[PDB]
Design a protein around this ligand. Structure first.
Ligand SMILES: Cc1cc2nc3c(=O)[nH]c(=O)nc-3n(C[C@H](O)[C@H](O)[C@H](O)COP(=O)(O)OP(=O)(O)OC[C@H]3O[C@@H](n4cnc5c(N)ncnc54)[C@H](O)[C@@H]3O)c2cc1C
Ligand SMILES: Cc1cc2nc3c(=O)[nH]c(=O)nc-3n(C[C@H](O)[C@H](O)[C@H](O)COP(=O)(O)OP(=O)(O)OC[C@H]3O[C@@H](n4cnc5c(N)ncnc54)[C@H](O)[C@@H]3O)c2cc1C
Ligand SMILES: O=c1ccn([C@@H]2O[C@H](COP(=O)(O)OP(=O)(O)O)[C@@H](O)[C@H]2O)c(=O)[nH]1
Ligand SMILES: O=c1ccn([C@@H]2O[C@H](COP(=O)(O)OP(=O)(O)O)[C@@H](O)[C@H]2O)c(=O)[nH]1
Lengths: 385, 386
């Protein structure tokens, strides 16, 4: 008892809202986490044989242009100067990526100036304007033209979504920078880097406040009925799956899940870069991570003749999988609305708020989760405390 | 005796020694600069029509792994987070550069793995071991193999030096990182970036001390007899050309000089990157600079539909020219040794010290000029000014 707030989930959304209540409002918070560790998908740990820091839940690369979010996270960890770059493997060649003069030179066979390249892509993309694009395929072609779409977007998306590119959200592809220069940074944000002391350390520092206690290995849906009887005093922030909150009363929301197969190899360097995208259908995995390259400043502590790689696979979320991505087909989006009604209803009736990637069925990055958490705290939780 | 110290030349070397005497030893310093501005080849200024900062003596990019140098320069200017990357234009294609998996893929036509690339380059470099490579051609081939050498080094080098690569220093090519991964940073140093407020501001801050007076438009060899009458006590640090100092007694050292064509173009972006190398003999210039891409953090101040470029041309230094590079052929290294002897004698006899790219005939980057000057101040001038 004595708890002012209950947060369901110790992911970044759950941790920010809890940390803000604790240090800004001085309220005692308890976070209920189902897993054996803090941090949700942002969690990382060292690989036993090599000591290399692994994102066991997918490559986690922090980037933001939100100054307020940047200053905030920098309270809990320093960040390296790492800048994410991705190469795209297609028909036996590693391509500069995303769209820029480098990829354009490599794929079309000669150098195009910025002006010449703008003209080239204008021609190949003419079949649809960006204003008229309502899904992933129309939008992609509109931004990068037909041939680049068919060569670098089609098969990849098929593997990542196993879904008709004509019903997936346009916003999925606008995640990637589209450029007419040689800049091949995978993100275009003001601030980015990796936690200097690793993710795990970062996330713990966040939860480290004395008005916060974490109960790991604990399922909310089990302990809720008494715990909030022990404390009808505390509001609840739920960052678990939405459709699961209401026991699939309206059905199952479409989610994608990922699998990670880790391999320790007898070479110091497998692919010479942190992430290689596999854009061809013949390769079952979407990309390969080589984690030693995420921290070149730890070179002296990495083994000289071993490396850990991880092949990443995508499939539909089955019950028992962690959902990683919302699919948000139009068919999905309807079901989503019905749950939103229910959700709205629950927050007033039962003082339960719905946040985070899983809580709102939204394709959120870390900095987006944190911003959305900051918004909920300032706009809602300040009142209800 | 209005001056405890006289410095010839206001390049980074000269500004460093002057600033240290001024702030660390409380000594009055005179810097004689021959040019109309201070800072030597690191000088920059805004282009009138566009306002874009131009490095007027060739693109200047600061990089170092020397922590003492880094902390020092950061007293006079902050630096951006910019990282230099260079692309190499060859047979109508812009290649990732210097050697990495990117260049190897593009030039050889398929992806090579790090291990495969190591084996591929091991084969192509078999004709010479790096241990036995004693000139530029041998060293380049030993490091990146014959085919990459002939496509990306030979012709560029020909334009830039106009000298048999078998007579050029091996050290010229080892300036470039040789990698078996996808990292295409042109430098591999711990610290790098651009002066946030430009080079001119940085260099002015260095010279901005009440113990320092700068005389521009002044040639040391013309004012020398008078200046050394009015302050016969003061040591002199000379950072001008070594062989000119002794009136070419031992002959002419080989030097290269540069010429630049600067052009304002009616487009917002000419080449999508700050430096494009032109590795083919068919282009008379060695590279093209597009200065706006050095400062993307100034995007809001850049014109939307204009850009300034600069084409760089190389030739031998003749009597009217400022020398930009030492050539250091074996014949040059002989002559140099003789000038070193003279210089040594002069330092004893006339208390004249010799420093910097021109003063010592060395292929020095900015951080090396500054490192060598910090060293000279501590190790020679503290003593000499006691
Ligand atoms: C493969 C992948 C790569 C990514 N890469 C990046 C990137 O490069 N850069 C970036 O900025 N973002 C990235 N992200 C996004 C980032 O992982 C998430 O957006 C962020 O973690 C979202 O925060 P969240 O709190 O909403 O989600 P979550 O981390 O999923 O929070 C859920 C937590 O609540 C717990 N929980 C669920 N149900 C219960 C329950 N019933 N009881 C108790 N606890 C429960 C879960 O165990 C989990 O720990 C990536 C995501 C993935 C999947
Ligand atoms: C095209 C080019 C690009 C370069 N790019 C980089 C880079 O990207 N990064 C990097 O770290 N370094 C770079 N450098 C190297 C850089 O220029 C040198 O490190 C630096 O200029 C050396 O400083 P310095 O003081 O020793 O010599 P200088 O800069 O040559 O200074 C010598 C000064 O002495 C003056 N002087 C000569 N004679 C007299 C006289 N008789 N009387 C009075 N004054 C005289 C000269 O006018 C000059 O101002 C580049 C050089 C060139 C040519
Ligand atoms: O090589 C690529 C990279 C991305 N995408 C598309 O762009 C979306 C977002 O890409 P991101 O790299 O942002 O995927 P995440 O890291 O979020 O899984 C993916 O879902 C794909 O549909 C693609 O088709 N090919
Ligand atoms: O595309 C290139 C780049 C460099 N070099 C060789 O490497 C030396 C050093 O190159 P840098 O880029 O350091 O030249 P700087 O910028 O000092 O003129 C040059 O003199 C050439 O001999 C070359 O042959 N081709």
């Amino acid at each position: 008892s004595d708890f002012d707030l209950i947060v369901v989930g110790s992911g970044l959304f759950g941790l920010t809202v809890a940390e803000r209540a604790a240090s800004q409002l001085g309220k005692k918070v308890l976070i209920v986490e189902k897993r054996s560790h803090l941090g949700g998908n942002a969690y990382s740990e060292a690989e036993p044989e090599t000591g290399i820091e692994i994102h066991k839940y997918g490559a986690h690369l922090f980037h933001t242009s939100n100054k307020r979010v940047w200053d905030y996270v920098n309270q809990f960890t320093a960040f390296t100067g790492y800048q994410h770059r991705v190469f795209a493997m297609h028909n036996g060649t590693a391509y500069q990526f995303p769209m820029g003069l480098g990829l354009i030179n490599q794929f079309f066979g000669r150098y195009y100036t910025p002006d010449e390249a703008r003209e080239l892509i204008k021609e190949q993309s003419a079949e649809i304007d960006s204003k008229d694009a309502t899904n992933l395929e129309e939008k992609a072609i509109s931004l990068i033209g037909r041939p680049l779409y068919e060569a670098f977007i089609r098969d990849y998306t098929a593997k990542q979504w196993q879904t008709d590119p004509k019903e997936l959200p346009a916003g999925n592809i606008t995640r990637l920078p589209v450029r007419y220069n040689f800049d091949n940074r995978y993100f275009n944000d003001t601030y980015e880097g990796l936690p200097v002391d690793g993710y795990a350390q970062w996330l713990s520092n966040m939860a480290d406040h004395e008005n916060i206690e974490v109960r790991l290995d604990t399922d909310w849906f089990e302990v809720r009925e008494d715990l909030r009887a022990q404390n009808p005093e505390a509001p609840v922030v739920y960052t678990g799956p939405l459709d699961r909150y209401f026991d699939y009363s309206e059905g199952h929301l479409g989610w994608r899940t990922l699998d990670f197969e880790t391999e320790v190899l007898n070479t110091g360097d497998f692919q010479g870069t942190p992430v290689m995208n596999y854009n061809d259908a013949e390769f079952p995995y979407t990309r390969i991570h080589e984690f030693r390259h995420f921290h070149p400043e730890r070179e002296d502590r990495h083994p000289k003749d071993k490396t850990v790689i991880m092949k990443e696979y995508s499939r539909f979320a089955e019950e028992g999988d962690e959902p990683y991505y919302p699919i948000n087909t139009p068919s999905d989006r309807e079901m989503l609305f019905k749950y939103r009604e229910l959700a709205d209803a629950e927050t007033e009736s039962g003082k339960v708020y719905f946040g985070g990637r899983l809580g709102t069925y939204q394709y959120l990055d870390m900095h987006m989760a944190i911003a959305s958490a900051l918004s909920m705290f300032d706009n809602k939780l300040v009142d209800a405390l």
